[PDB]
Design a protein around this ligand. Structure first.
Ligand SMILES: O=C(O)c1ccc(/C=N/n2c(-c3ccc(Cl)cc3)n[nH]c2=S)cc1
Ligand SMILES: O=C(O)c1ccc(/C=N/n2c(-c3ccc(Cl)cc3)n[nH]c2=S)cc1
Ligand SMILES: [Cl-]
Lengths: 242, 241
């Protein structure tokens, strides 16, 4: 069912980096990774949590639809793209933490906890501030657990409405062309060691879907582009994309 | 409406001619290289797969975007048609026989009513129920395409929200960190003049630009110019990098 391919480590070491890529072939129900141990080690989800947070916010009516505007609170933050109005599409795209922190406060800890249990999401533990636990609280999730969660979303099998799931998958749109469609979410965990970067999602082909989840050590923001670059090198090696 | 004839340079570069029509949604302003051709109505050809999909989904002819429509075993000229398809791939490869079967299940009565509800083109389905958008009486202009697409974008067509969301998913053509294009190609060859279509929209962070283009297309060799010329216009207008 699972196969370890250490040759993928060549894509990590050439960028003076360390991490894991996990792939799941949906048609064949087979998994592949460069590092079986790390594939199953759990980390703070950081902004990959915007996928379940979006789902919950939509299903509860906290977010009406993908056009609703969440106005900037006027607090100038370090990431420039955060300092303006957003909707669900752009808030996901730019990983706009303050928008989702407000979602979390409106959702509340009771409903948040209940929903993550229903989602079977990670360790299901929201200990910490209700509006930052995915950044510095108790929640943890592994790459293989990310894939399990994403497979449910792809198939509309999560316990929220079909509409909520369709809207979040639209908001996850990252890249598309005549060869493939990538729906995904980046993450960057900086508050608690070890600092790591994430990229989780899937690649839609004409006749199959490949789920993926990667994380890597990220001591500085300098290497954030490596999340997508290394994943795409693995996808290219495995002939999933040209 | 504003006419910018300088866009014609993008057509003459390839010894071609046609029209691109743009609509700036935020500003409610339109732009085109040729106001008269912008309003000239043609057979929609495979751009008709947008309303046809909507109707098929809303009536349950298509259950969802995963349902598989098996190849009937007839070897047709376009190789990608000779295989099983779902709604996503049928739209991607403009697989006429899949949609012809849809049209038959839908029937002329329901098709006619729906196109009237959609205010679509001249709303005329005269001809074969399974080919009228290729060689029948239906006609639509580039500006009329944009009117229809704007309703779809806003989920304002008289079909369910789910049907409209699914079709907009199936229209996905290109996406990156700068833009998202949802669109549908068309190639009208059965009746003169032979023309190529590309209609859809460009999603930006803070605006949407609707577009509809058609161009003379005497041979299939120039089909790539539909997208290429459109993107040159988009580049000139600073809509995409
Ligand atoms: O701990 C936080 O509050 C936090 C920090 C950075 C981010 C976003 N990181 N990030 C970035 C990012 C990070 C830093 C800079 Cl300067 C630019 C982009 N790109 N993609 C992602 S994900 C999210 C949350
Ligand atoms: O009149 C028809 O039955 C008909 C002919 C060609 C098409 C497909 N046109 N087309 C094509 C196309 C046309 C010819 C070839 Cl060889 C390959 C693709 N690319 N994109 C589009 S749209 C659709 C319908
Ligand atoms: Cl989409």
């Amino acid at each position: 069912e699972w196969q370890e391919n250490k040759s993928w480590n060549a894509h990590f070491t050439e960028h003076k980096s360390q991490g894991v890529v996990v792939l799941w072939n949906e048609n064949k129900q087979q998994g592949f990774t460069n590092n079986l141990k790390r594939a199953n080690q759990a980390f703070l989800p950081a902004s990959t949590f915007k996928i379940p947070n979006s789902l919950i916010a939509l299903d509860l009516g906290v977010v009406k639809d993908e056009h609703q505007v969440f106005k900037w609170d006027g607090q100038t933050r370090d990431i420039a793209t955060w300092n303006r109005d957003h909707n669900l599409i752009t808030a996901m795209k730019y990983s706009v933490v303050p928008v989702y922190q407000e979602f979390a406060r409106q959702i509340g800890e009771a409903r948040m906890s209940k929903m993550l249990h229903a989602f079977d999401y990670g360790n299901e533990d929201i200990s910490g501030n209700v509006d930052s636990f995915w950044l510095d609280g108790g929640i943890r999730i592994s790459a293989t657990e990310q894939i399990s969660f994403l497979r449910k979303l792809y198939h509309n099998k999560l316990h929220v409405s079909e509409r909520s799931q369709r809207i979040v998958k639209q908001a996850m749109l990252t890249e598309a062309n005549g060869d493939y469609i990538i729906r995904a979410k980046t993450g960057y965990s900086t508050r608690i060691e070890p600092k790591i970067g994430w990229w989780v999602g899937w690649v839609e082909l004409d006749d199959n879907v490949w789920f993926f989840a990667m994380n890597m050590d990220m001591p500085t923001s300098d290497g954030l582009g490596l999340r997508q670059a290394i994943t795409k090198e693995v996808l290219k090696q495995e002939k999933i994309i040209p």
